[PDB]
């Protein structure tokens, strides 16, 4: 069972700079027929993997000369020169010299200047309330870096249970991320309190961004 | 150019299901074909492959012959028969063309979910500003998609004609049901004067919900 180990797990790079990704195999990938069946694939957000480099160093049709694969035996490297935003995603190496196996992937992240989130809060809809549920939603849009914390308060008290936080992958359009934070209560608990607040801590600001509403004003 | 997998979807543990994949643009019998699967958390796994005429196959050993790869040369179709399914077989399955050891064409992927739980359609709720908030030059609207099973759903805005400023947030499983959301931003002078509707398709329940956003 040949293990493919990729380093690093995540790689941040500035536009126009070079990215280097390592892939090691636990056994030589030189087949008895002399070929080395080591290949590289790129999976962009929301897409299937596509072939980038086959047999160590051969660029697949359509791949720019910016992408270069090298190595031998058990040690291989993918180099991406002059990185462009659309290069982002997960790069996987794969071997098929032996029973075929894949590396765990390396996520290429594009560096941009820090950008503050645009925060929007929404009360539960009357449709949802009609069915006895009550979700409160905060969208945090177009921010960088990805690290961000959302804290919900109900009448001033932190509520940690019942929160679903979901990040997008990086957008190649602007190198930003977005995330949604959803606090799901029962209607019973929702109607017993008035103040609903989401607070975003991000480092683009010293003080957290607060968006809030009062249930009786909805 | 192009491999398209059949709809996957929900299957009960211990039961069977068959995926198909339709090939186009090449002489099908001039290429090996393969199936690969991907589970989040994480990793791609080679499942099976087959030679030109189907006289020789390879399977991931741990499948214990529960899976069968075959190809209808007369119809340009690749099959994966899956028997006695367990939750460990839940994954996105990709059809792929295999050349000289590498996968040079991949399908879009189809998700298979092995569960005893019932198919449940999504509830789709509007996210609109309210609560006596003021409004600036733009307005962010959204849809909250709750209570569905299995994955996946697809959300579009105005039948796809609104696309530029859309964010789609990945689904999260909670209490055995999925929740996701989508946001869109439009100039505030244009809403509600020019309507905004989110369309949520959930193939597993054969349901589409087209929810109009109201102030």
């Amino acid at each position: 069972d040949v293990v493919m180990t990729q380093t690093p797990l995540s790689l941040p790079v500035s536009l126009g700079d070079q990215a280097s990704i390592s892939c090691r195999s636990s056994q030589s990938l030189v087949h008895s027929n002399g070929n080395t069946y080591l290949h590289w694939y790129l999976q962009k957000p929301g897409q299937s993997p596509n072939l980038l480099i086959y047999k160590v160093s051969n660029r697949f049709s359509g791949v720019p000369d910016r992408f270069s694969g090298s190595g031998s035996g058990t040690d291989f490297t993918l180099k991406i020169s002059r990185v462009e935003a659309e290069d982002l995603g997960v790069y996987f190496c794969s071997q098929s010299t032996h029973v075929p196996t894949f590396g765990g992937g390396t996520k290429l992240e594009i560096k941009r200047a820090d950008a503050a989130p645009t925060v929007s809060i929404f009360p539960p809809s009357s449709e949802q309330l009609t069915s006895g549920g009550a979700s409160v939603v905060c969208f945090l849009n177009n921010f960088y870096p990805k690290d961000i914390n959302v804290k919900w308060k109900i009448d001033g008290s932190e509520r940690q249970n019942g929160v679903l936080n979901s990040w997008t992958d990086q957008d190649s359009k602007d190198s930003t991320y977005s995330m949604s934070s959803t606090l799901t209560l029962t209607k019973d608990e929702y109607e017993r309190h008035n103040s609903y607040t989401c607070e975003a801590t991000h480092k683009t600001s010293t003080s957290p961004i607060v968006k809030s509403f009062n249930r009786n004003e909805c | 150019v192009k491999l398209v997998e059949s709809e996957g979807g929900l299957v009960q543990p211990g039961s069977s299901m068959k995926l198909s994949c339709t090939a186009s643009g090449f002489t099908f019998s001039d290429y090996y074909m393969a199936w690969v699967r991907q589970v989040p958390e994480k990793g791609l796994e080679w499942v099976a492959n087959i030679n030109y005429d189907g006289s020789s196959t390879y399977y991931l050993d741990s499948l214990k012959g529960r899976f069968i790869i075959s190809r209808d040369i007369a119809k340009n179709i690749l099959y994966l028969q899956m028997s006695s399914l367990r939750c460990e077989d839940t994954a996105t399955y990709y059809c792929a063309r295999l050349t000289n050891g590498y996968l040079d064409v991949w399908g879009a992927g189809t998700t298979v979910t092995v569960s005893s739980a019932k198919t449940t359609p999504p509830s789709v709720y509007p996210l609109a500003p309210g609560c006596g908030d003021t409004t600036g030059s733009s307005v962010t609207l959204g849809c909250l998609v709750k209570g569905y099973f299995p994955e996946s759903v697809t959300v579009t805005w105005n039948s796809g004609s609104l696309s530029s400023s859309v964010h789609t947030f990945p689904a999260l499983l909670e209490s055995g049901l999925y929740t996701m959301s989508s946001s869109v931003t439009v100039p505030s002078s244009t809403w509600p004067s020019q309507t905004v509707t989110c369309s949520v398709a959930h193939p597993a329940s054969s349901t589409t919900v087209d929810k109009k956003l109201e102030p």
């Binding site: 098929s96 | 090996y32 492959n49 030679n51």
Partner: peptide
């Protein structure tokens, strides 16, 4: 030209 080299 075996297409699946590990099968050798």
């Amino acid at each position: 030209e075996p297409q699946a080299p590990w099968m050798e």
